[PDB]
C-alpha cells in the first residue's frame, strides 16, 4: 500500500497549478491536506470494500473445498481491517499533502 | 534532370462522418537540392499535413511521392525513418527537446539511432555548436538556455544527420526578428551549403525570406511561384538516460525502489530463516 | 511490485511530447519499449541489489 502514497504524490504534483487556483480562491492551507487525504483514505476504504468482498469470495471458495475444514466469520477482524486500511491511508496521505500545504499560491501559479 | 522529390497528384484524406475529408487533393510538385521553399497558405489547409507527407508521417494512398526517385508508398515507415537519418532534419517553432539532456545530448540523439561511436559524433556536435557559435551553453539544460539558442540546438540536431532535407515549423515566430531572421540567415547558409530546406508559414512576411513561396488552398496548391550494436549502446546510453529520468524524480524513484527492496529482502529473509529453523 | 507498472505508466504518460520528439527523430516503435522496459527492469535489479543487501543485513 505504500506506493499509493507515491501515486498521490504524483497526482498532487500534477495539480500544482490547480493547487494555485485553489489557493487563489482563498482555500485554507489545511484544506488541501483535507481533501487529498480524504480522497486517499477513500481509495483505501473502497479498496477495502472490494478487498473484503474478494476475501469473502475466497471464503465461499473454501466452502467449496471442505475436507472437514470449516469457515468462520470474524467481524471484529473485519472492522480492524477497515480501521487498518484507514490508518494506513492517513499514514500515507498525511505528509505529501502536508508539503502541499507548505506550498505558496504564487509559485503554484506563476511557474510554467 | 530529375528532382529529388516528385509530389505529383499526391493527396491525403482522413475520415469524418465515417468518410475521408478533403484535407488534400491531387497536387504536382518537384524539388531540387538547395531549395529554400516557403509553404504559404491558409492555416489548417493540411499544408501542415502536407508537411507530414514531407515528413512521411503517413502514406497519402495517392500519387507517387518519389523521394530521390523512390515513391513513399513502397518503403517501410521504418525505412522512411532510415531516410530521415539519411536525409530529414526537422525543426519546429517550439524547439522541442528533453529537459533531461544537455544540449549536446539533445543534438546527440538522432545519431544514436545510427550506429556510431559516441565520442566522434560528440566532437562533430561540438563542431555544430561552434557553428551555432555556442560552446559554454553545451552543458546547460534547455530550460537554462535562451529560446533562440534552443532553436539553434534544433538546427545542430538537424545537422548531425547532415540536414539533407529540412522541414521548418515557424522558424522565427516564437521570438524576435533579430535572432529569428538571424537564424533565417543561417538557413540561407545551409542553402549555401546546398542542403534542401523548407519552411512552413501562413505569414508572407517571413516567407519573403524564402526563395520559393508556394500557396495551397482547398487541398491543392493555388500556385507555385519560386543492429545489436545500438541495442547494447542502447543498454548503456539509455542506462544514462535512465539515471537522468530517475533524476527527474529521485523521490518517486526512492519510494519505488523501496517498494522493491522491502519485498525482495523479505523474500530472502523468510526463505532463509524458515529454511534454517527447518534445518 | 505491481504498482511500479502504474508508476512507469504515469512517467511515460508524462513523456508523451517526449515520445513525439523521439519518434520525430525516427525512433523505431520497438525502441521505446526497449528503453522503457530496460529502465524498469533496471529499477527492479538495483532494488534487488539494495534489497538483497538489506536482507543480508537482516542475516
From Swiss-Prot, chain B:
ATP binds at residues 41-48. Residues 1-253 are cytoplasmic. The chain holds residues 1 to 298 of 648 of the full protein. Residues 5-226 form the ABC transporter domain. Part of the tripartite efflux system MacAB-TolC. MacB is a non-canonical ABC transporter that contains transmembrane domains (TMD), which form a pore in the inner membrane, and an ATP-binding domain (NBD), which is responsible for energy generation. When overexpressed, the system confers resistance against macrolides composed of 14- and 15-membered lactones but no or weak resistance against 16-membered ones. In addition, the system could also transport R-LPS or a similar glycolipid. The gene is macB. It comes from Escherichia coli (strain K12). The chain crosses the membrane at residues 254-274. Disulfide bonds: none annotated. It is found in: Cell inner membrane. Belongs to the ABC transporter superfamily. Macrolide exporter (TC 3.A.1.122) family. The lineage of its organism: Bacteria, Pseudomonadati, Pseudomonadota, Gammaproteobacteria, Enterobacterales. It comes from the Bacteria. Homodimer. Part of the tripartite efflux system MacAB-TolC, which is composed of an inner membrane transporter, MacB, a periplasmic membrane fusion protein, MacA, and an outer membrane component, TolC. The complex forms a large protein conduit and can translocate molecules across both the inner and outer membranes. Interacts with MacA. This is Macrolide export ATP-binding/permease protein MacB.
Amino acid at each position: 500500500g505504500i506506493g499509493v502514497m507515491n501515486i498521490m504524490l504524483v497526482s498532487v504534483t500534477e495539480r500544482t497549478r490547480e493547487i494555485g487556483i485553489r489557493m487563489a480562491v482563498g482555500a485554507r492551507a489545511s484544506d488541501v491536506l483535507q481533501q487529498f487525504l480524504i480522497e486517499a483514505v477513500l481509495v483505501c476504504l473502497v479498496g477495502g470494500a472490494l478487498g473484503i468482498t474478494l476475501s469473502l469470495l475466497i471464503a465461499f471458495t473454501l466452502q467449496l473445498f471442505l475436507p472437514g475444514w470449516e469457515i468462520g466469520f470474524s467481524p471484529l477482524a473485519l472492522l480492524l481491517a477497515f480501521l487498518c486500511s484507514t490508518v494506513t491511508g492517513i499514514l500515507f496521505g498525511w505528509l505529501p499533502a502536508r508539503n502541499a500545504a507548505r506550498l505558496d499560491p504564487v509559485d503554484a501559479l506563476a511557474r510554467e | 534532370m530529375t528532382p529529388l522529390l516528385e509530389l505529383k497528384d499526391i493527396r491525403r484524406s482522413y475520415p469524418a462522418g465515417d468518410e475521408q475529408v478533403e484535407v488534400l487533393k491531387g497536387i504536382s510538385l518537384d524539388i531540387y537540392a538547395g531549395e529554400m521553399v516557403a509553404i504559404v497558405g491558409a492555416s489548417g489547409s493540411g499544408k501542415s499535413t502536407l508537411m507530414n507527407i514531407l515528413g512521411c508521417l503517413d502514406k497519402a494512398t495517392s500519387g507517387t511521392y518519389r523521394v530521390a526517385g523512390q515513391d513513399v508508398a513502397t518503403l517501410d515507415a521504418d525505412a522512411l525513418a532510415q531516410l530521415r537519418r539519411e536525409h530529414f532534419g526537422f525543426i519546429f517553432q517550439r524547439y522541442h527537446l528533453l529537459s533531461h539532456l544537455t544540449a549536446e545530448q539533445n543534438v546527440e540523439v538522432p545519431a544514436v539511432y545510427a550506429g556510431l561511436e559516441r565520442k566522434q559524433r560528440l566532437l562533430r556536435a561540438q563542431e555544430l555548436l561552434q557553428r551555432l557559435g555556442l560552446e559554454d551553453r553545451t552543458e546547460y539544460y534547455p530550460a537554462q538556455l535562451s529560446g533562440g539558442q534552443q532553436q539553434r540546438v534544433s538546427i545542430a540536431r538537424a545537422l548531425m544527420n547532415g540536414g539533407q532535407v529540412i522541414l521548418a515549423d515557424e522558424p522565427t515566430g516564437a521570438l524576435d526578428s533579430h535572432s529569428g531572421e538571424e537564424v533565417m540567415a543561417i538557413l540561407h547558409q545551409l542553402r549555401d551549403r546546398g542542403h534542401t530546406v523548407i519552411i512552413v508559414t501562413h505569414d508572407p512576411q517571413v516567407a519573403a525570406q524564402a526563395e520559393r513561396v508556394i500557396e495551397i488552398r482547398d487541398g491543392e496548391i493555388v500556385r507555385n511561384p519560386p543492429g545489436w550494436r545500438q541495442f547494447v549502446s542502447g543498454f548503456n546510453e539509455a542506462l544514462t538516460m535512465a539515471w537522468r529520468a530517475l533524476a527527474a524524480n529521485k523521490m518517486r524513484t526512492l519510494l519505488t525502489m523501496l517498494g522493491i527492496i522491502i519485498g525482495i529482502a523479505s523474500v530472502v529473509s523468510i526463505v532463509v530463516v524458515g529454511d534454517a529453523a527447518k534445518q
